[PDB]
Amino acid sequence: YAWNRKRISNCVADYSVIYNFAPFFAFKCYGVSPTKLNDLCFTNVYADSF
Amino acid sequence: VIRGNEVSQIAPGQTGNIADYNYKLPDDFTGCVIAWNSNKLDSKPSGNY
């Protein structure tokens, strides 16, 4: 009900380490490929944790 | 033998570490993937490495 939202901006993100260490049983992407994340530029990045 | 969470990566077009550098499937792959847990045989208590 009170899920935490963190804004991510003005950083260069290496998503490869997310894969390198990962207890993430489920890693499901909807609008983008996981391996292409290193090749793209983004804005409006938000992490919602609950 | 792979991890429990890596069974999604043994598919055509999958993004992963073992998908890119260990075992690659073609996009036009036909066949069946069989996955089963091997805790009884492929695991040891101190760590099966």
Specify the experimental method.
cryo-EM
Tokens at A30, concatenated? 């909807």
Largest CA-CA distance found in chain A, in angstroms, rounded? 34
Q: Is the Cβ pair B5, A36 closer than 8 Å?
A: no
Per-residue tokens: A25: 């049983």
Q: What is the C-alpha separation between B4 and B38, in angstroms, rounded? A: 10
The residue assigned the tokens 């570490």 is B17
Interchain CB distance below 8 Å, B5 and A24: yes
Answer yes or no: do B5 and A25 touch at CB < 8 A.
yes
Q: Spell out the residues 6+ positions from residue A38 whose beta carbon is closer than 8 angstroms to its own.
A: A14, A15, A16
**Which single residue is written with the structure tokens 């550098």?**
B21
Count CB-CB contacts under 10 A for residue A13.
13
This PDB structure is determined at a resolution in Å of 2.8
- Using an 8 Å Cβ cutoff, are B25 and A44 in contact? no
d(CA A19, CA A27): 10
**B4, B5, B15 ranked by CB distance to A35: nearest:** B15
